[PDB]
Design a protein around this ligand. Structure first.
Ligand SMILES: O=C[C@H](O)[C@@H](O)[C@H](O)[C@H](O)CO
Ligand SMILES: [Co+2]
Ligand SMILES: [Mg+2]
Length: 387
């Protein structure tokens, strides 16, 4: 049961199944993967498409000649399988030139180089059919308080994204940008550390309609925040352009576990939210098969990502469709939350004596919210103990 088909819109980064397992304390445990091979292996598992960094597909320092050979064979693999490329991004973190950042490096010449490297890959992304261009500023930040004037850094960050929007606008490209937040690692503190900081920042850009967020389960969980709550606020603002799905076990290093691992109940409430809201973008997996695994374990880990989404989707549909759950939701007054507080208006509210002078505060205090019975019904459905 629970088999993925291209209609489920599951996508994967080339850097995910392709991670060789080199972490801070150890050397790589797997051989490098050919991107053509990843495309074919992922198509056979039922994936909708792939994503990439420029440096995943074209090795850094490649001439214009070698570049076109790498793009050509990749394209052939896409043409042959029907795999899509819905999203692409730039590597502005691996090479030592970016050790203090790309867009917010203190050195001005590095910031201009960062912009040129990005613009080049946007042209390629659009050619391949990508609709979202992701920016993760993993090197934008500091280890010490005096190294970075954060107000000046935000001016430089705003300058770079405005320039990018002017570029896609002048070229007539039908592509949008999505900022991916992370609170720390590899820098001591990273700029725009959460979904909220990223949403606020977009509103100061010159063309705010071109920019949204690409939140990641584990990144918000590295700050101890409620990921479904943060997704709700991004949807409320009309800014959920893309999403990165994986797992994370609490506040620690970025684990990038397969989706469904880590905080399982949060994964259930996330899937409930994405499906009931009708999110229609890619279900992208940004995970790392643990370096304990050989290549058989890499493909099993990837399949597990899609399988866990499909199970949770089924459990959330059953939860919502259960008449007993619908009764529970009315008993907890979820339906009154959808009602305006004072659609009668400010003057009516001020003259309404039942809202203050004659409000029976003790009777309203004594009402039970009945939240625990509702939560146990959610638990029963998740576990298939009444589904
Ligand atoms: O290893 C890859 C990054 O750490 C990942 O978090 C970003 O999603 C990627 O750069 C795409 O922007
Ligand atoms: Co991560
Ligand atoms: Mg990510």
């Amino acid at each position: 049961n629970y088999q993925p088909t291209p209609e489920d819109r599951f996508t994967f980064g080339l850097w995910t199944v392709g991670w060789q397992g080199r972490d801070p304390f150890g050397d790589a445990t797997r051989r490098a993967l050919d991107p053509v091979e990843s495309v074919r292996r992922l198509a056979e598992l039922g994936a909708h498409g792939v994503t990439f960094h420029d440096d995943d597909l074209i090795p850094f320092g490649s001439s214009d000649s070698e570049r076109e050979e790498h793009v050509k064979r990749f394209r052939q693999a896409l043409d042959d399988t029907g795999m899509k490329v819905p999203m692409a991004t730039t590597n502005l973190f691996t090479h030592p030139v970016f050790k203090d950042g790309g867009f917010t490096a203190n050195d001005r010449d590095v910031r201009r180089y960062a912009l040129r490297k990005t613009i080049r890959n946007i042209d390629l992304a659009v050619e391949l059919g990508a609709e979202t261009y992701v920016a993760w500023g993993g090197r934008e930040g500091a280890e010490s308080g005096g190294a970075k004037d954060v107000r000046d850094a935000l001016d430089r960050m705003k300058e770079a994204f405005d320039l990018l929007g002017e570029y896609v606008t002048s070229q007539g490209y039908d592509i949008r940008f999505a900022i991916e937040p992370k609170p720390n690692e590899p820098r001591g503190d990273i700029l725009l550390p959460t979904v909220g900081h990223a949403l606020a920042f977009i509103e100061r850009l010159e063309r705010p309609e071109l920019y949204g967020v690409n939140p990641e389960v584990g990144h918000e969980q590295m700050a101890g925040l409620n990921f479904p709550h943060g997704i709700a606020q991004a949807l409320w603002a009309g800014k959920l352009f893309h999403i990165d799905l994986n797992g994370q076990n609490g506040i620690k290093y970025d684990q990038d576990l397969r989706f469904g691992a880590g905080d399982l109940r949060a994964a259930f409430w996330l899937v409930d939210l994405l499906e009931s809201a009708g999110y229609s973008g890619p279900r992208h997996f940004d995970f790392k098969p643990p370096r304990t695994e050989d290549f058989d374990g890499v493909w099993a880990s990837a399949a597990g990502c899609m399988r866990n989404y499909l199970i949770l989707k089924e459990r959330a549909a059953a939860f919502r469709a259960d008449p007993e759950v619908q009764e529970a939701l009315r008993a907890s007054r979820l339906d009154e939350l959808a009602r305006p507080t004072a659609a009668d208006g400010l003057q009516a509210l001020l003259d309404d004596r039942s809202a203050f002078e004659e409000f029976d505060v003790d009777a309203a205090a004594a009402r039970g919210m009945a939240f625990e019975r509702l939560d146990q019904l959610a638990m029963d459905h998740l576990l298939g103990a009444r589904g």
